């Protein structure tokens, strides 16, 4: 009966850092994806394994929505087959992903003239993430893998800050990102 709560995801007040990305399960509801695809608003709206404008014709077992912020130049890493600090150490899509990646510029809500440094990303890690893996640890990193206690030689804090200012070019501006994963294997999320 009830409509899927895409508004609570896309219009949420607070989005997380990409290393601490958050997931909402969407189930047992009617999804009208034209609220997404019939709008001109997204800077990125890329689907994999599925056509955006055909979503209202399909039923899925579940839909997942993953939310986070990255700078504009990093949105390209939120795709199957990419590498880079974001895809490798923060948020990884599988090569055979079925779903859509949506992103939009949020300069006036996530940046400020004096600079917003609260959004973070992981830049050091022993090994790449598996697809949809999340790592929210904050363990001092050493290249030899041995434990270390900052401040010390060859010991590094693994998270770094984005610095979001209103005055930078768009590649450095903040973008909110929602990744919709469509699960096939009884369907609970259907178009109208």
């Amino acid at each position: 009966t009830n409509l899927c709560p895409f508004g609570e995801v896309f219009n949420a007040t607070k989005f997380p850092s990409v290393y601490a990305w958050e997931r909402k399960k969407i189930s047992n509801c009617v999804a009208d994806y034209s609220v997404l695809y019939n709008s001109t608003f997204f800077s990125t709206f890329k689907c994999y394994g599925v056509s955006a404008t055909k979503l209202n014709d399909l039923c899925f077992s579940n839909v997942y929505a993953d939310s986070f912020v990255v700078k504009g130049d990093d949105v390209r890493q939120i795709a199957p087959g990419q590498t880079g600090v974001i895809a490798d150490y923060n948020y990884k899509l599988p090569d055979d992903f079925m779903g859509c990646v949506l992103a939009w510029n949020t300069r006036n809500i996530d940046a400020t003239s004096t600079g917003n440094h609260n959004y973070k990303y992981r830049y050091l890690r022993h090994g790449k993430l598996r697809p949809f893996e999340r790592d929210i640890s904050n363990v001092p990193f050493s290249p030899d893998g041995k434990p270390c206690t900052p401040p010390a030689l060859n010991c590094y804090w693994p998270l770094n800050d984005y610095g979001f200012y209103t005055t930078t070019g768009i590649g450095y501006q903040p973008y909110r990102v929602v990744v919709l994963s469509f699960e096939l294997l009884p369907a609970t999320v259907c178009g109208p």
Epitope: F10, T13, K14, F41, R107, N108, I109, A111, S113
Partner: antibody
Framework: EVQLVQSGAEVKKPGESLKISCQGS????????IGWVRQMPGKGLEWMGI????????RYSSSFQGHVTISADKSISTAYLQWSSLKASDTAMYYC????????????????WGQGTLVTVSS | DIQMTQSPSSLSASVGDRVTITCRAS??????LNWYQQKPGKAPKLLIY???SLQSGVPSRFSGSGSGTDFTLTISSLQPEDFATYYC???????????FGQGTKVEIKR
Amino acid sequence: EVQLVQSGAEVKKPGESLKISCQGSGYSFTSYWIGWVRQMPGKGLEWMGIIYPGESDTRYSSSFQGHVTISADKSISTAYLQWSSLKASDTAMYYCARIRGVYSSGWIGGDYWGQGTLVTVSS
Amino acid sequence: DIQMTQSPSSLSASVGDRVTITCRASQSISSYLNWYQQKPGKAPKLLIYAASSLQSGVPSRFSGSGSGTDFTLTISSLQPEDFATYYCQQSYSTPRQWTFGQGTKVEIKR
């Protein structure tokens, strides 16, 4: 019900410090931006700034950070507006207001408002 | 900076009249336009947000339209409790630049 309750009317002399407050109830205080609005006598409305409680995130309007500090103590669901050295020109009504939220790439206005705090500054 | 200018600054109307108040922004603010009501001595009240979305509890005789630089608040049939001052406010910018219009006072014609 959502309620914002402000501290009472203030009468101060120029050069004095002053901290007024606004306590939210009936909603998750750490989940909404809350901010302050000035209405000088006979004049319209001006945002002073907003704060997201329980994050470290205060966003001032215009040049207000040079004269006022906005802060919050999430542990008692209270937002504050404070001056270190008042001027007679600070005489005004001050409102606290909860920001409804955001959508797409911009903001919503204030959905719930406090009752107002009158501040008179005079020698 | 974004300047918000309302027209008219004052309007005299009768109960039952259709009332239109306009708000112009000095640059495009997309849909991020809010309207408030304020009566003497009382706090502002949000009527409309996102240019045309009615805040819960506000009567449907209030409606908003427009986009970009030009916006309208319409009261389809003015009622006795509607005589008040109305403000627009853009919320497109960062909070550093949020701005209100100067107000439109709707008074009773006699």
